[PDB]
């Protein structure tokens, strides 16, 4: 067939969300019923299909433990060194039932500083203090509240601390019952400690009563937050790993902006041999071949989307790129033939559209845009005509690529940048749990439109309809002047 | 067939107003000469094929009158309690030949203010008397002409009635016979009673001068104007459904977001069967699968549309709809083998998208926008920029939801609420009447150009042609400077 | 076939001007040496392939003075009355070579008046004179410059005409001989008597100059300018045709919006009977059926075109219409079969536009918007922002109908008016022939092209070729700042 | 076959830029390691794929420098004399190595004016002396630095030049041998004489130092800048071509508005059959069988496009075009059969678009307004709004062929012109190296996508695929506010 790849240049023909529309049908089930939980994997279980982006203006730790509160997943970015994201992600892990098998502890002869720092770092409301550092027998505990009594933080820890007994409990207390035993003696710390005497971790009230008021977290076996972290391909990819998979990251994001290339399929290959049980995530590719070769590699999760996004340029100036939805689906049909999920990054401007995403066959969405101006993201609030504006950049914009995205556009060493992406702002949103019940909201109706009691059956079973342009504009409002709008709109 | 759902996600392809043009055919019929009346059922009759959406920026008692009188019907929105609803169907059917079968009266121990109260209820001008509850002998009558010699109506009927013998008549006495009695003896009013004296009814002139005054008039057959009633699917759904039907409504609409849900299908079959001359019209539908499923559980008209009203956001916030003009002919097709007409109900811009939806098989279209700055509709009129509007909301709007439109998106209980219509403004429109006849008038002018002489020739026969963009741009007026417009356009 | 016609509801798919481009060919022939002319019939012939519109706004007599001297043709409209219409129609028959067969002439008795209204009112320099009205001797020639001498115009003529034997000619004179005879006795009138000194005719300079001054004129056999006049379906045609044909009209043009009404059949066969060799235009029709009805109703021309003018509604707001170019094709596919040329009517922006109608089948274009900003055109010229505007509306909007257009729109009794048109204003364009030279000049391009030396060639042979939106923003100018635009763009 | 032109009227599709997008591929090379050179032919071979359009308002001698120098190549237009249009083309040939083989003198007799003349026209620091014409033996050599020692140049060169032996060189001497001669011994300048002393040539350091500054320069066997020159279809056309092949022309692009003219085939076999290895470009031409024409008569590069560039309006006045995308791949499609290559020639607004062209089978592309506003472009800078422009007109607009460009369009002697394009001004750009790195720093990263190592790989192999306008939207940057753009995008 010498003129194949010839005459079938033109042939290939892609949609996007704007294009298309999901038909309702018989349905059983409302939206209040309807299950919204997503597996990634049996070590990765999502109460809610979203994931924000690991971006320097979206992720880092206080975004990853907020999203890991309300069911999702934060991907740490990696525009910072290997020390500070190896730091973040101890931040998330530590943040609920982190010191529980693996406290932090203290001697008598530490000065209050060090306590200070633990206590702040963590954010965590007493530090445990054991006799030395082999024996590890525990002494007693300052906190928050022996703190507020503490003038000069420059003085020794045994000065501080005076001594009654106090209670402790056996290992492997369990948050139920720590729950009655702080509440039977009035106590908020609740060491953990062997026959001998020997500190073996810690319980707050903090541990406990954070589960009363995030019910739907997305946790490990330990009960400790989810948290994922950004990692290119880069000749300190595995040092980066390292470190992350010692801060007991859940899942690393080899993050590049062509999935295909051999330098990516190689790199997951090298990861998958050292770390045979670790969570990879491996993208961007836009097609079904694409999406066979990472996970021959050992990708186990897919991530999806090349030049949708926002703020990316790459369609423009590349002039490469598939319509996301059309990506989606052909991305989903190989990995289902391989039991994979596949995540749909990039493109999603409403609600509806990450319906549509998840109806084409994605287990998830990643967000970049609609969680940037979000309170707990990382960049502060700037004033624009008197509103409030968050920046957000694509990773391809020159001020992402100036601050270490350069390997994702494989021009890591390059003096002069060709960028492809762009830089602007968005709305301050606050917190992010509201812009998180929209989203579900707008889900758990479609779902029910479409008679899926779950994502399974969403993405088995929901068909959609093209429509024209001129279908867009119905669908929207239209030809009516809004007084008015709604979170979920506009 | 395993995979067969899966490959069938994308095939489907819809079409809305903008996308197509009727195509113009062989006519010996003139727009003045057609026919523009349809039939819903044999107890529903309209001379003009319009109705107005129970929503309640939309449709309330004068909105109905206005309509009624115009040929059409307006649907009395559920926004209100069930006492209230219940209220306006009564005046609406009250307004005309209210009283001949059924009529109000008092006793003279009753004060004035009773009489006053009637008579602004129900805009008649007189009140019959009698002698007490039980035998109902007309007494006399206290009318309009009575009233304004009264300064206190605290006092009781008998002190202000003169005696004099009245002109009364036979039971039975008709319209066309009242209106010669009533001229002969010069008098305004005409009581019916039997050979006892036993007061039966009564007949105004107002009843026969309104038959002259609209000629058009939708009637049941007792002569009084048609009203429909929107009942949502909830658990006080009977109760208020039983009050409406003790009112005399012609038709209930049961209205919810999915009517392909189990729950509207059950509470279908349970009206029905209570309840087996009623009319019902059940909604909303998109496709054929759905339309036979209300049919097949007792509902006589289906009502189609979802997404496509110009305040609705469903297709954007929960990605799901069908394009209207598809819509309605995927369940026209449907309802035809079954003898059942339905309902387009949704994004109606122009006369002409009217006449598209009638042509693509509807038996009549049901407007929101086009309706809501007219004068008969319940908001007052509101300023901006020195002239006047009116407000408009979505069913889905925040606004409406917290009204008691809930229900309709399966929202019923819910503390936070995730909106599928947003909040907007319409300008005021003066007059229905004038709106409706450019209605009309447009209906009137496409059936002339399809060669239909009446609907039925214009659903079974018409054709349209697909066009572009760059066609829709061509329809429209363009590339000149517009000094004035017109009723019909902008 | 029971369910044929609701099945083929949405099959047929149109397109106009936006949609397509045409594709360049082999071409051995230069802009400047193709022929544009076209000949409807024997007795239509034009040198251009242009019509203006008979529409109040576009033509009258000026205008069609104008049209037929660059060798197009003028429509004067209907809106005006039959007496008012036929004149307009002999002013511009009687511009050039009037008064050679059928002059006008006076007697020494009438006043100066009557000569002075001759001269003005057909801008004829001199007014013959005969002895009597029976015998019609010539006597002698009152001119301009005999009328600068004459104070008072209530004077009879045999006091200011001084007697001189004046130089006259044989009946059957022509312009070429006629040109000499007044070089050589250096005179600018030439009355024509026969030998018994009766007079026959006249011919002027102005006759012989206006021939040199518009080479390409449109011409009937005896060398007057063309003209067209505008008859609508009333019951008073045939007394508005009969004084047309009798002012020397070389066409009507029926002019309906629905020309595949009986109605409009019916008209054409019974005009057609009484006048044979009239020619007859008649529109408007979309399609193939309706242009084959026409033809066989006795219509020797068809114009094409529902909806698509700059001005009409008729799309919108009776949602009926096909895109023109596909009208003009279809209907063109059908006029071939017997011989018959089409006309486009509507829908051209630009130059190139009118190529692809031409292009697509169409003998002749008819333009209204490009022709309304004319200096020949009726309105005069108002101001908005310093800049000068011509109005222009709509056969179809209420201002039109008012003037007598009703017929047209089959709104002819109505006291309340339902529009297809509305009212705009257009940039003052200066002198017809500039406009003219650019849309020829845009034509000629075009077929220097398509390889096409006439029309002929083009209709028979170019083709187009499909693009979309894209391809559209690709061939207007785009993403450059305009500084000066040009009178065939913008 | 009657009626077969007839029916196939609509049947063509065309796409542009803007309906495409390439998909991404299995890809081992890096955007850093690709190859971007192209061979036009074995005399012609750039280092990229870029050419600067011949028209007034973007190349002359400087742009061609640059551009050359970059590695792509300058088309000096035709807006000038033939005089003036040969000294251009000189002038960008004696920018390097000029001189090394046929070198510039003069004799001590000359005036020190003639020595500022040469050395101002060329650039070229000094000047050789010889002892007469005939004999040409070197006396010696006035230079930049003997130079600012003179004030009156009105003087003999015998009196300036203080005699020396200076160092000189055999023929046939070389770069990189003249460069360690230059540094041994101190000197700029190196005659370069015969054994008899007669001067055969001269090297600079200016020579030997734009090597290392330009290591990309697209370069002649002599080492010589490659240089362009437009040419039209004239009865001068051969005259203007003589005076450029003694300059040493290394193309001629015969340049026509439509490339299947009879008029141009003849004129590209008349000059090939006298300059049978000249370089010929001919266009344009949007067809397969135009391009195999103009190849049959001779013309070893094709230039593709009809209509498409962003100051043309020869689709929207004559109504002619073929959709870029399409014409590219539809001529290449034909040449590739001949081992032709095809120039894509208009419509380019971004990298990305220049790379689709490329993928659809062109080898080269040229632009006229990504260059336009560039520091070397021929006009000046414009103020409007504090910002700097440069005007950018069309070859087809008024002011474009008054200035010549007239026989173009075939207006040749037209006193009134219809013109094909329009005025307009892009903002100024700085120096054309900036524009051209982001141009080729595109190519490189959709060659990364598409895997090609090379441009042949890159059409033969690449694949698009085809999205709607809701797609485009998807792909540029959306809904989001941008606080600070790239120069590649916008």
Redesign the interface.
Known sequence: QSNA??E???V?????????????????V???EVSVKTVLSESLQLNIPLISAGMDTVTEADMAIAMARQGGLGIIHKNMSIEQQAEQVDKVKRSESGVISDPFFLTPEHQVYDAEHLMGKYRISGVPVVNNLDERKLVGIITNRDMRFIQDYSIKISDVMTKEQLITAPVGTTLSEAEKILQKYKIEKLPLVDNNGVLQGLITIKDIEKVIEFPNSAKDKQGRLLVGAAVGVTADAMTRIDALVKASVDAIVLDT??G????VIDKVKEVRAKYPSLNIIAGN???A??TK?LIEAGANVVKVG???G???????????????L?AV?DCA?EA?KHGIPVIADG?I????????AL??GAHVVMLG?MFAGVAESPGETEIYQGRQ?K??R?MG???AMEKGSKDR???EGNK?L?????????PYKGPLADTV??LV??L???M????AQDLEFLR???????????????????????????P??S
Chains 1, 2, 3, 4 share one sequence.
């Open positions: 790849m010839w079938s240049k033109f290939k023909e892609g949609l996007t969300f704007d294009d298309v529309l999901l038909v309702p049908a018989k349905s059983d409302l939206p209040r902006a062509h295909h290339s051999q330098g590719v836009a097609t071949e694409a070769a090349i030049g949708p926002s703020i990316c340029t790459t369609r423009v100036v590349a002039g490469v790129g598939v319509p996301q059309t689906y049909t289902r493109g401007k409403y609600s509806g559209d990450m319906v549509k109806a084409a845009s504006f920046v957000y694509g914009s020159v001020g556009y494989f021009q002069k060709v960028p492809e992406g762009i830089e602007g702002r968005v019940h929209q909201g707008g758990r109706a479609g029910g439109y479409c008679g088995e079973n929901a068909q959609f309809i093209r429509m024209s342009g001129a279908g867009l504009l119905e669908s929207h409002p239209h030809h009516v002047q809004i007084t008015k709008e709604a979920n709109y």
